[PDB]
Design a protein around this ligand. Structure first.
Ligand SMILES: [Ca+2]
Length: 844
């Protein structure tokens, strides 16, 4: 009869390991007595906690499963089938308790018991991911949505959790103005703990953090020179779009970006917003930041980079873009944008997924790779980059960069991993395209200016495109300009088919513009049998001069243009520049301080086009071995290169210390997107890129060359929060819709949902709001679109908890982990006025 001894020492909450006054399958508790060393019933002390599952079970079948399991762990030989009597099971459990206590004494610890109990727990369906099925296509197989109104978990109640309020669906109804993306333009649950960005208190906290990032130097190091200048908005299509008005309002109120282009261009901030509706929405919102040109990205991808037999026609390079470049003669383009072909995730982690799925692990889930899978995949990927026939990696990267780097009316963004290997130490190894890219970047400072014309010509058995910049001061082909128009401008010629052959009578006649009659040109880049040859000066290309005729036309023939197939080129690339630019010729233009008057902040004119963004990291960089390999230490050492390349905006990796849970790629390669503490920029320990002091130094080094530095602002989610919390939860898909056939619907669930209360969030959270409301009261007077109300700065978030989150990815804890009385279907509880405990533990 152990029931008397094992009864609870008392009903005080302090006697149990509870979470918000609920018990869980893994809760331990203090009994009245302990069977010391298996032999002597002895009054417990405060240290004498033991698992609830040693003395209590939720039903007879769970007691059987516990006995059979613990017998196997403890070398007790008997197993019990379903016909076993209640008596046999109770005796067996008491025998088990006996052995447990001999073993606690012999081994001087209870950690072993912690481990066997937790392992037992995970064998039960009600306590593992089996009761969290069916799964759905969320990246981590499912989400849990926290209930707004629940008497069981009133501390996690909310009046908000307004979901899927993307730019397209900001008002809860698809916007009728934007029709190129017919969906609702994104979805609320992406990864990990999903932050409730419709909560006005959470919105003020995202503004606090934005302000922190943009005064990072002032706040952390007292150095007005180590501040981030601009931001990237991460995962726009997964958060409430009110944040876009908040960040734009902040840029305007704090930095004056709406006053003149000099101010806007010193703080040029971008969105990562993939819906086609996001660009026109951002334009109507005031061009307070710029978005990607996703159409053009797709055209470069399918016209140039795809496997030969999947490759489209070339005309989309001209017309399938935010800007039709057939004839782009505008002083200011209709909408600003940035343009890229690959980014740290886009067309990098997808290709690693393709490799693993095809050759290594065919059941890999989403991008939840292991480090071992990644390393094996890189063996296959790095070979493929060097081959002429590529199975998995991009073709024609140089052709894509020649268009990106000469196009008018978009800021190009160069991806770090197109110049340096995607894996390996920062900047330690150059790709085979590094030299072609660097030559384009340097020629771009010197030659790329004026209006643009693109032509598509069908020739021989295929087609080419030609792309011309007329030179600084000539927006149209008829403009004559002056001396510097004459020595600037560029022509790019491309084909995308290696069997391209011209007839003997074919000509590609290219109008260079009226500044360029009767003139010597020389090659910048030519395709060759094995690669691409780069010419770094007029002299280096001295045997290869050609001329324009009376009319300002260069004319090309079969002798110049044919299709090749080599590691760099599948098709054709030729680029020519006018002879005789001075060594330091620079055709870029600085922004004006004249006041803006069109109601837009950022303007796609010659000053914005003079800019180049560099996305300065790869997800798959190796981990540093020593101080000198840290990314931020290496950026500071090589700041001269970025300036030589004309980089004007350096997009650094998010700098938050990474969590290490491994539940998704970001927290396996620790890029900085999966983090527990938003304000921990290499402060508590190094991030992947160095210490907070290395970050300070890289930002100062970039500033000493006039280069602006972008903070990646990541409001969508947080990972691996250290403290447990009980919520009332429903299994939902990535939009928040309840999953059909699930067992978890308004049922209690223990999430990892609170931050420590003692980290950088606790020090800075809400710390600037008083100052922000004094200096910029207009930020706080907007009534935000999704909620209809202003931000609410009256509460500081020093500790995150479930009330500020929409939900979480499913955790594999099971539908029944919070314990219940099966007889009455009522949760056990330790709240003092309302205590409800297993009867056999309080009244044996
Ligand atoms: Ca979200």
């Amino acid at each position: 009869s152990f029931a008397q001894y094992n009864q609870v020492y008392s009903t005080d909450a302090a006697n149990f390991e509870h979470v918000d006054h609920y018990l869980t399958a893994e809760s331990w508790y203090r009994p009245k007595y302990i069977l010391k060393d298996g032999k002597t019933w002895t009054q417990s002390t405060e240290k004498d906690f033991r698992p609830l599952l040693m003395t209590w079970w939720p039903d007879q079948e769970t007691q059987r499963q516990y006995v059979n399991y613990m017998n196997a762990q403890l070398g007790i030989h008997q197993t019990y089938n379903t016909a076993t009597s209640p008596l046999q099971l109770n005796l067996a459990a008491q025998t088990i308790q006996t052995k447990i206590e001999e073993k606690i004494t012999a081994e001087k610890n209870t950690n072993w018991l912690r481990q066997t109990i937790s392992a037992f727990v995970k064998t039960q369906s009600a306590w593992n991911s089996d009761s969290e099925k069916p799964f759905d296509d969320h990246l981590q197989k499912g989400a849990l949505l926290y209930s707004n109104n629940s008497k069981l978990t009133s501390q996690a109640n909310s009046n908000y959790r307004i979901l899927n309020r993307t730019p397209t669906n900001q008002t809860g109804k698809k916007d009728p103005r934007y029709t190129a993306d017919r969906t609702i333009g994104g979805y609320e649950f992406l990864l990990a703990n999903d932050v409730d960005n419709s909560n006005p208190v959470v919105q003020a906290e995202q503004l606090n953090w934005l302000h922190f990032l943009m005064n990072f130097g002032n706040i952390y190091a007292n150095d007005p020179d180590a501040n981030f200048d601009s931001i990237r908005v991460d995962a726009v299509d997964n958060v409430d779009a009110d944040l876009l008005q908040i960040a734009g309002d902040y840029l305007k109120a704090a930095k004056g970006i709406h006053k003149n282009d000099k101010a806007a261009n010193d703080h040029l901030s971008i969105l990562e917003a993939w819906s086609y509706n996001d660009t026109p929405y951002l334009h109507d919102d005031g061009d307070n930041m710029i978005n990607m040109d996703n159409r053009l990205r797709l055209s470069l991808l399918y016209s140039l980079a795809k496997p030969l037999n999947q490759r489209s026609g070339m005309n989309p390079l001209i017309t399938n873009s935010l800007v039709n470049r057939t004839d782009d003669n505008a002083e200011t383009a209709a909408v600003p944008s940035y343009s890229f072909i690959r980014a740290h995730d886009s067309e990098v982690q997808d290709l690693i997924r393709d490799i693993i799925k095809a050759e290594i692990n065919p059941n890999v889930v989403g991008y939840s790779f292991t480090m071992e899978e990644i390393k094996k995949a890189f063996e296959i990927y790095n070979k493929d980059l060097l081959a002429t026939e590529k199975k998995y990696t991009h073709y024609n990267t140089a052709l894509s960069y020649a268009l990106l780097l000469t196009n008018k009316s978009s800021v190009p963004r160069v991806y770090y991993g197109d110049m340096f290997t995607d894996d390996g130490q920062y900047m330690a190894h150059k790709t085979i395209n590094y030299e072609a890219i660097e030559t384009l970047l340097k020629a771009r400072i010197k030659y790329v200016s004026g209006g643009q014309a693109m032509r598509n010509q069908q020739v021989g058995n295929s087609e080419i495109i030609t792309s011309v910049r007329y030179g600084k001061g000539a927006l149209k082909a008829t403009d004559t300009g002056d001396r510097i128009t004459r020595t600037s401008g560029v022509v790019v010629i491309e084909g995308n088919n290696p069997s391209l052959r011209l007839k003997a009578s074919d000509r590609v006649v290219v109008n260079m513009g009226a500044a360029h009659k009767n003139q010597a040109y020389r090659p910048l880049l030519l395709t060759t049998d094995n690669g691409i040859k780069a010419y770094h000066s007029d002299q280096e290309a001295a045997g290869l001069v050609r001329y324009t005729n009376d009319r300002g036309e260069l004319i090309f023939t079969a002798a110049d243009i044919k299709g090749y197939a080599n590691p760099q080129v599948s098709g054709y690339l030729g680029v020519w520049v006018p002879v005789g630019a001075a060594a330091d010729q620079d055709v870029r233009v600085a922004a004006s301080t004249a006041p803006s008057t069109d109601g837009k902040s950022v303007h796609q004119n010659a000053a914005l086009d003079s800019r180049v963004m560099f996305e300065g990291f790869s997800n798959f960089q190796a981990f540093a071995t020593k101080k000198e390999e840290y990314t931020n230490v290496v950026i500071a050492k090589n700041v001269d290169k970025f300036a030589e390349w004309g980089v004007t905006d350096f997009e650094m990796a998010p700098q938050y210390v990474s969590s290490t849970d491994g539940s998704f790629l970001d927290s396996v390669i620790q890029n900085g997107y999966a983090f527990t503490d938003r304000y921990d920029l290499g402060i508590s320990k190094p991030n992947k890129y160095g210490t907070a002091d290395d970050l300070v130094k890289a930002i100062k080094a970039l500033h000493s060359k006039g280069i602006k530095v972008m903070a990646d602002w990541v409001p969508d989610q947080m990972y691996a929060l250290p403290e447990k919390e009980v919520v009332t939860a429903t299994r939902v898909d990535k939009y928040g819709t309840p999953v059909a056939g699930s067992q978890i619907k308004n049922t209690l669930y223990v999430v990892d949902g609170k931050s420590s209360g003692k980290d950088q969030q606790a020090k800075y959270g809400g710390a600037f709001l008083e100052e922000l409301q004094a200096k910029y009261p207009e930020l706080f007077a907007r009534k935000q679109i999704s909620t209809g109300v202003p931000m609410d700065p009256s509460v500081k978030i020093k500790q995150w908890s479930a009330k500020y989150f929409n939900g979480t990815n499913i955790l594999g804890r099971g539908a029944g982990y919070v314990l219940k009385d099966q007889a009455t279907n009522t949760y056990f509880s330790l709240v003092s006025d309302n205590t409800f405990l297993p009867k056999s533990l309080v009244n044996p």
